């Protein structure tokens, strides 16, 4: 359950995601694997294993049908890391392979399917890499959109994850989570971009305006728990399981998400006030998994 000697005193500053389109259906993405201290609860630092110094990692957004030319630069001084995108068709033993310390690797694979996909490290033991922070979301936008696109006023991305005792494989396998948390990742400049902690989305709530229809792209990265996702004070008008437009449910109070499962959910906020966003497995909500949406008459705070 200990800290790797070579990580003592290592705290690598966050590095921005690099992404550029190189053709109509081809995108370059470069990420790092790095060791970064994150305050997951007030007064509690976790020396996380991260992509780009965030946990969950940075949001990646591509279009349906894009081929991704992905480079991972491993800045960890001792532990290999790798990348597995749930969005892609790839050979795990050729394309999701380990990149050694202070090396890079480049892999190419297509994102054929629209949706809200988990990404994570694929290095054995996978549980250890996920639990220590190596998870995130890639959104693949559908070529023809969603049937409800014209009704949506505002969009945000939320992610649920757990935290355990530091680097403790016994706890990761057999224990209950110490914290369960939400984070938000920016779809556009100015949106909140946060890490998985117990407090930021309570103290700095997401904003909306009375009468708006909100869309959330959500994924429960786990590693271990399922999620019962609910927004207090509203009902989901439309739900698309895994973000695929064909998996269309209506009028849900709560959306069941497996570990790694995603959804697009849409709902209307009819009155001003503060709306909690929870997992309705309330032991997890009590351990941190409550975010806030503040709805005002103007949409500003």
């Amino acid at each position: 359950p200990n800290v790797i000697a070579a990580h003592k005193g290592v705290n690598q500053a966050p590095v921005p995601l690099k992404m550029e389109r190189v053709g109509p259906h081809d995108v370059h993405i470069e990420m790092t694997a790095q060791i970064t201290d994150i305050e997951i609860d007030k007064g509690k630092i976790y020396k996380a294993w991260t992509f780009n110094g965030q946990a969950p990692g940075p949001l990646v957004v591509v279009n349906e049908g894009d081929t991704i030319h992905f480079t991972l630069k491993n800045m960890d001084p001792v532990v290999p890391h790798s990348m597995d995108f749930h969005a892609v068709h790839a050979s795990p033993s050729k394309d999701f392979i380990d990149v050694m310390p202070n090396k890079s690797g480049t892999f190419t694979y297509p994102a054929n399917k629209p949706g809200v996909f988990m990404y994570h490290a694929g290095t054995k033991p996978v549980l250890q890499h996920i639990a220590n922070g190596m998870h995130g979301v890639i959104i693949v936008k559908p070529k023809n959109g969603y049937p409800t696109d014209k009704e949506v006023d505002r969009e945000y991305v939320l992610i649920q994850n757990e935290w355990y005792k530091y680097n403790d494989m016994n706890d990761f396998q057999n224990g209950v989570p110490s914290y369960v948390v939400f984070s938000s990742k920016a779809l556009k400049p100015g949106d909140p971009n946060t890490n998985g902690d117990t407090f930021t989305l309570k103290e700095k709530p997401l904003l909306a305006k009375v009468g708006e229809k909100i869309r959330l792209y959500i994924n429960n990265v786990g590693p271990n728990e399922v999620s019962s996702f609910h927004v207090v004070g509203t009902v989901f008008d439309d739900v698309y399981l895994d973000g695929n437009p064909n998996n269309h449910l209506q009028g849900m109070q709560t959306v069941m998400l497996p570990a790694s499962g995603g959804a697009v959910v849409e709902f209307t906020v009819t009155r001003p006030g503060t709306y909690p966003i929870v997992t309705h497995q309330f032991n997890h909500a009590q351990k941190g998994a409550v975010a806030m949406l503040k709805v005002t008459e103007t949409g500003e705070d």
Copy 2:
């Protein structure tokens, strides 16, 4: 993990739900918050935090499009309580607010969406209020019914909940349930109306007649567990997730319910006998979550 000193010796007798329609699309509902001893297992009393002296609370049935004018009278001598209906569009910070001891509050909000919705207290810590008994179901009947209405012979309502060590926030967050239980709530005069205990629906089974198609309205209120709902000896002909007629599945053996999730399920019983109703997460079934349906040639016992 203790008993509040002011609740020592308090056992407030159940009070009937009060509901009256005041217009074609407007309904008044008055409930209490009260402290009531419930026998959750033989020889085991839980001094529950309840609505109206039942846990889960009384069934509320309204029509799609009704506006609810809801009054809560708090009879607890020391703890504030509140009401959150998953059925409604409301401002949580204005409409789901605490009512102080020996006060009342009135709130108004619409139920726009059909289905089988959880209700519960919204007072912090929400986990504590739910785990101590402040949960229940509100059914919103669809304006145009369900496509299978003409095939259904009999209807019942079941609810699943957990019980933990008394008022023990550590156990509520980190422990396994001590009991997991079903209760049934009356849709019409004469139907069974019970509390969440390990024994009543085994000793006094629900009744049906050979060849009938039964509909169950079900909700898993939690607080913490998901449910794998199954009726032994049959297969669900039709399932409507959250009770919304558009979320229509067929031929399911078992229905996955998130915490707070609901469904309408319909099935046929072809032969006389006793049919267990379970969560198929069998550790929970062993801890109380088995109800019985007795099917006879006449439908009487």
Copy 3:
């Protein structure tokens, strides 16, 4: 948590499933209940309570609309056993009854609904019988097939189950699983047929050829956990919940399965390599629930 004295030194050799069609819509099936040592992890023997000396038990495949004439021969010297098929309409108290040691019983019931159904012992306490190994799958093939039948190149059956401390009712109710495992059952001669262990499907992977569309029939028998089923390196093109052709989802990364829940999932493998098959609840994957699919240019190893 002990071994029954009468099972000390008992290790009954596996007996083949007996099945013969006796009419266009009538099938005879004969199974045993027997006590058989299974190596569930390297160096760890579990003296399992089984059907036919396998755990999970043998695969049963029938056609939609078949009536099953089922015989159970109980070879256990002291414990009664029984059979509950989720596929059938039956009276649990008449048709799923106990067969005493060294007796047989015969029961008749129809399989009206297509899908991938759990079977298990129905003897009280059911949790004890399931946890000790008395579970399996019955597939009911749809009369008109699946809409995607013409696209499928290869089929396999996988089952997920847990193992606990030996015959320990406290652990079964309150503990975390010691192991979570996959097994594969043969649809046709030559397919792998294995027991639920931590290693066989890693050391002897399932085979496929580059470019194939694979169909898996899957069921999570539990007893206690839900499953977040995922194949690394691909996305499910089509999913049929519980194997019913009408419950059709597309483009899922991960399929949520309740305890006893099934699915038919189909996906394409585009590149050669080894593809892990997991539950994405990664504590369970770490405890054994990883199988391998080896994809080669020829489909041979």
